[PDB]
Amino acid sequence: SGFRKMAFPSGKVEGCMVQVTCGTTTLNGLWLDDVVYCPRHVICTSEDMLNPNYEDLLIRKSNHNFLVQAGNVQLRVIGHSMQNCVLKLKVDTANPKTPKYKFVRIQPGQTFSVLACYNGSPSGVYQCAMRPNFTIKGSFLNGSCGSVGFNIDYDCVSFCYMHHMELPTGVHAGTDLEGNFYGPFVDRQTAQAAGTDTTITVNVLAWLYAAVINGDRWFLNRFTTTLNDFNLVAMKYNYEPLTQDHVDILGPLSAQTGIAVLDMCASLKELLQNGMNGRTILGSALLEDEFTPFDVVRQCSGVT
């Protein structure tokens, strides 16, 4: 029993973290096979951070300008290319600790683990969700750029996020491992606003199921609702619309608890309308939306 915000074990990713230095800028790179991936803004100077022309900045750069260190030992860079907002540095050594891996672009509401790194060294692991406004709410200090987000399927690491920057509001933006930003963000030192940070409804429902499974059931009510009625309440409370695809994904949690998805929606509706009244669910005084249905099944079944 017990329900914790739980990250994937980070060992497989720790073995991929390197330091990349260009000029006076040091951040993190991900070393998979004979390629090191990092934020392209590693080449950026104070002058150009406002309106950087990355193709022009890169003309001034050679292989030997990129210093790649894996521990207290240097890697030889034998090629470099820009793919969207990432640099790929070809090195002469395949990372011997390269795990089975994929690059995936996640949808908003999907959760992943972040290994926060500084100078190619892991400092910490935490769990977070791609917000519906394509920001994440991380913990990133200067030097954390190139830190990655991942999910682990048994022994296969799916890399979904590379950290690039902090918005003036102190929320975080980054790319997939093809260098494409989540959301409308650009690797530029211009004020950029996030849109509405809506609540991930399906994830709240999953965590309500986790709560019932773990014996926190005070909030279960006598009501049901319909997807249309629920969604009217959702929209009013800045909750993402619930689709039949979401209802389908919640099916196994429904089956385990014997609580129909629409019944749990009606319980959530009353929690939105009435608030928690100083009570907690799974030790939270607000409705948690950074567990997916997959996370709840995983944690409640013990997948390794």
Place this chain on the structure above:
Amino acid sequence: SGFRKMAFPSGKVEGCMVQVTCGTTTLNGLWLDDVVYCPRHVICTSEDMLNPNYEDLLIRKSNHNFLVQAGNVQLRVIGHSMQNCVLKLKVDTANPKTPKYKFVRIQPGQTFSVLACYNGSPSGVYQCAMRPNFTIKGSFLNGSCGSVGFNIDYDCVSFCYMHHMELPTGVHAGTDLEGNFYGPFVDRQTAQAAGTDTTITVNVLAWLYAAVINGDRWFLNRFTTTLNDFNLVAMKYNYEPLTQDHVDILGPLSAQTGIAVLDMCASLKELLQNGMNGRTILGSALLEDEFTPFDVVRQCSGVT
């Protein structure tokens, strides 16, 4: 910026996890040098779980009765001994992935990372605190026994916790790596009640400092208090007494923010008396007590 419940990177501990099987019971062991540590209740049968006499159960056991698997490969057990509530299994192979390590017994209020494991395989990492009643609030399914709690000092792993059991209330009890239970708990299938789960005051203050550092400052008030006045309020709200030792430890957070410790205590006093009024701090609707002053400095300074 941003403040996350952050675990230590778990790689160094992943490399120490093994499966231990005695009869039909399988749980986790920690393989350091040529010793495997696990809960002694691995020898326990349905018959004896109510009033197990471990010394008597162990007479019936030989080295070859303990099956130790590290991956899909078996370790040869060449000795076994009981130390308090742990079995030490001597194996013929030193774990080649043995990190620099210590065994430490932590105090209540101290935080650590748990690598939740099943069949010697890591499933997840999360952060938790030794509660003042010497329970922890984990996420442990059957087969998770032998999962360990640790802190990581640069490259040295301090092991502080081994998981042993779940109380009827679904909170968790375990030992240090010398096999001594935290709290008054015994490795026996008898109903055992936890004492008062009080709030770790010093940890709340540390997290209030983290909040200010991260620009969440709405709760800062015009008041100060004294340790005696604060502690009268603390006791009424089931908060642990604040000592001068706690004030001393908060000194650097005081220094960084320019908020005197007693001023932050007065802010906390008003939050206890007035509640949060539907506002959040660092995205929590309640006062978080599972960050130590050390954790806040670490996360707010980027230690690897």
